[PDB]
């Protein structure tokens, strides 16, 4: 099997983006921030708090013929962003761009952090990183992928996201149309429970190239590229005006600058980020100040090739028995 679906950035900056998927019979439709960096498929549902639903489009499982409870289950987590949720879990029918999951855990938001409650465009999050790091207690579940998986003509899915326009989640095929020249394949570590892979160097415009180890996650969940602060640093000098401002949270620039490309490197190959996509616009409104969208990761914990560098390639997510994954220009 296979399964389609295209992906829409949520706003004008392409801060996340959202993925429609079924749920129950008859279908519940809602739209699901896709997350390479996290393994829970959580929804906004009837059982969510009243005051913290403002917007979103809700899952009601007594409404689904095929839901059951998980009984006893329960789970929460707690996103890099300080952004939280939590709640009980349903089994239900999933299906994403054509492919269906039967038995897939939904779990069913009580509580939602006030981010999420902020944001009515976002109804729950698809996780699609190793199940390992699924929540669910006392019975971990299973990614859609991980469910997936076997069905699927090759246990593979791809991410193909748009700047500024939309673009498309592909599972069980690559689709060779989509990118020009090779796919490059690089090593993944499971370790974290991540797609976690070595980046082999950046280059900012057209200087040169600097060979270096750069170990992070391909996270679709995550808006910015989030490097080592030597790099980052290295890329703002570049930038006529462009400061770390401690009060704003990052690197600004003015708007009147023009950015450079960035280039990070896949083996021997390069993905070239274009400028502009380094561009998340005024810090408030009216403001001259841009804030800036390659950042650093100190105090992460970890660097994070989030939705700016990977919409600047076509990147697959490769979950054969020792997973890897892919990059394309396009």
Not at 199 to 212: H, I
Not at 216 to 239: E, K, N, R
Not at 248 to 253: A, E, K, S
């Amino acid at each position: 099997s296979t399964g389609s679906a295209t992906t829409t950035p949520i706003d004008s900056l392409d801060d996340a983006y959202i993925t429609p998927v079924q749920i129950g019979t008859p279908a519940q439709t809602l739209n699901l921030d896709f997350d390479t960096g996290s393994s829970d498929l959580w929804v906004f549902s009837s059982e969510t708090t009243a005051s913290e639903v403002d917007g979103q489009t809700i899952y009601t499982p007594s409404k689904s013929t095929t839901a059951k409870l998980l009984s006893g289950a329960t789970w929460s987590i707690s996103y890099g962003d300080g952004s939280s949720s939590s709640g009980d879990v349903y089994t239900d029918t999933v299906s994403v761009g054509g492919l269906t999951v039967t038995g897939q855990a939904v779990e069913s938001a009580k509580k939602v952090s006030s981010s999420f409650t902020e944001d009515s465009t976002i109804d729950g999050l698809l996780g699609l990183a190793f199940s390992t790091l699924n929540t669910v207690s006392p019975t971990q579940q299973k990614t859609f992928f991980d469910n997936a998986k076997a069905s699927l003509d090759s246990p593979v899915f791809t991410a193909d996201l748009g700047y500024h326009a939309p673009g498309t989640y592909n599972f069980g095929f690559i689709d060779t149309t989509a990118y020009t020249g090779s796919i490059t394949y690089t090593a993944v570590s499971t370790k974290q429970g991540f797609w976690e892979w070595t980046s082999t160097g950046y280059a900012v415009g057209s200087g040169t190239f600097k060979s270096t180890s750069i170990d992070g996650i391909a996270d679709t969940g995550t808006t910015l590229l989030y490097l080592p602060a030597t790099v980052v640093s290295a890329y703002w000098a570049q930038v006529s005006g462009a400061k770390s401002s401690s009060s704003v949270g990052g690197y600004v620039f003015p708007c009147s600058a023009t950015l450079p490309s960035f280039t990070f490197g896949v083996g021997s190959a390069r993905i070239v980020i274009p400028g502009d996509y380094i561009d998340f616009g005024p810090i408030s409104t009216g403001s001259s100040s841009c804030f800036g969208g390659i950042q650093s990761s100190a105090g992460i914990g970890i660097n994070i090739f989030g939705d700016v560098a990977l919409k600047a390639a076509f990147v697959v997510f490769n979950g054969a028995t020792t997973p890897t994954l892919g990059f394309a220009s396009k």
